[PDB]
Amino acid sequence: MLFTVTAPKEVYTVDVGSSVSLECDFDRRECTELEGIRASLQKVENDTSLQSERATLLEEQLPLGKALFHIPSVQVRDSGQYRCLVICGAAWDYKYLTVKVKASYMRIDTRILEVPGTGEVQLTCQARGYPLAEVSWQNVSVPANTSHIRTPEGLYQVTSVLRLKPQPSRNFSCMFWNAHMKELTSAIIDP
Amino acid sequence: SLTFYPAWLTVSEGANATFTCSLSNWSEDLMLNWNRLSPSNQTEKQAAFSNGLSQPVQDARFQIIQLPNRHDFHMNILDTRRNDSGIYLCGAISLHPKAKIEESPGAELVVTER
Question: Which chain A residue has its CA at the smallest distance from B34's CA?
């Protein structure tokens, strides 16, 4: 039989904590025998394509020529390459699908501290998100020190610390640029 | 384990080109597909071999012939055209409840003018 599978969407970008429904369409006129259809999803890891235990096939879409695989509350460990596989009788086909994940650097914790001795102030912004953000401080010529760690859930915790002599009536704004996702977020610190 | 070779092949248009897909283990439940990669590296099925029969998807110039040792297969493109130039691979799965998609490395075809 002339059985093929197509993937209407090759790359899915998903917010951490939200679901994804990965789709592959298949040829129903060459697989009229809906009884012997076997649709499955595999995640590729260590160059090994093993069946996914996160995804559920929404089998109510099968009669319509659509294999839809639902993954709830997507995490960083769910990102990467998948294969949707459909077997109908003595024929099969598959397609690759990529899941990219995102977590907005939306909660930014701030701190202000006076640095004893120096007369300087120390200002800190810290936020978790995904992929790795860069931080800059708006209209400040003094360089900050920015670093990151990974959280147990796979996010980046990015912390930026600026130390300087505080200027009169001046607020300081730290700006997180999540480049891969084209998102800017920011917090204002009033000393 | 699958190999697909020669890792690159160059022929003039009109030539009947051959890649060999070689399996570490053949059994008659296996279904063998010959795929082509798209510009975004998506797989696209060209032809299949199962139950002793080669079945092209949409172009009958794509033929799969199982060789007498049952493990090696000739993946032939008859009457090559410039538009056949690209990357190809073979893939196999069994009909078994627990089956992994197995793929060979890619191999490149370049079909030149005249």
Answer: A93
